[PDB]
């Protein structure tokens, strides 16, 4: 399933990198290239099964300490 | 391989 990420599921990783203090650019689209192994240039570019998963580990990261 | 489910920092 390659359909391409969503808005709402958007909204809500940047919701969690802003309250993480943390940027696609620097932070998740690297982690993301290393995860998935492939070239991911923008957060556009995420499949929704791809940014589930990123989301569920910045809920973890926002979840575990302040 | 390293994935989502696993305890990497961030």
Same mark, same amino acid.
């Given at each position: 399933d390659?359909?391409?990420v969503?808005?709402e599921?958007?909204?809500?990783?940047?919701?969690l990198?802003? *309250?993480?203090?943390?940027?696609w650019?620097d932070?998740?689209?690297?982690?993301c290239? #290393?995860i998935f192994?492939?070239?991911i240039? *923008?957060?556009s570019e995420?499949? #929704?099964?791809?940014?589930?998963?990123?989301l569920g580990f910045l809920? #973890?990261? *926002? *979840?575990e #300490?302040? | 391989w390293?994935?989502?489910?696993d305890?990497?920092?961030?």
């Amino acid at each position: 399933d390659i359909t391409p990420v969503n808005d709402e599921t958007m909204q809500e990783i940047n919701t969690l990198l802003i *309250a993480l203090d943390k940027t696609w650019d620097d932070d998740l689209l690297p982690l993301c290239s #290393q995860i998935f192994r492939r070239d991911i240039r *923008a957060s556009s570019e995420l499949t #929704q099964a791809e940014a589930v998963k990123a989301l569920g580990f910045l809920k #973890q990261k *926002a *979840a575990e #300490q302040k | 391989w390293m994935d989502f489910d696993d305890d990497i920092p961030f």
